[PDB]
Amino acid sequence: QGGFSGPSGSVTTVESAKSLRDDTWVTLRGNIVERISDDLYVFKDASGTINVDIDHKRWNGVTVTPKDTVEIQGEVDKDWNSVEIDVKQIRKV
């Protein structure tokens, strides 16, 4: 009961992503609405909000504001005290 969780079409809701197991690959769509600290941002979709970690290298020349719909792909990082998405890719849509 193991395998690769990663890219090879489904967009998951923020609220349900919070329920997934640690180390699960997800794609979400929504808006980045606030920067909370170094590399930590708040991502919101119609179902809820979740914190996302976006390293400086993920932007790739793209400027994103809260009005931009963006698609993010990365891993659910869940610990005893937190759930966040470690973002591998962000693109505007």
Curated annotation (Swiss-Prot):
To H.influenzae HI_1709. This is Protein YgiW. It is found in: Periplasm. Its main location: periplasm. It comes from the Bacteria. Keywords: Periplasm, Signal. One of its GO terms (cellular component) is periplasmic space.
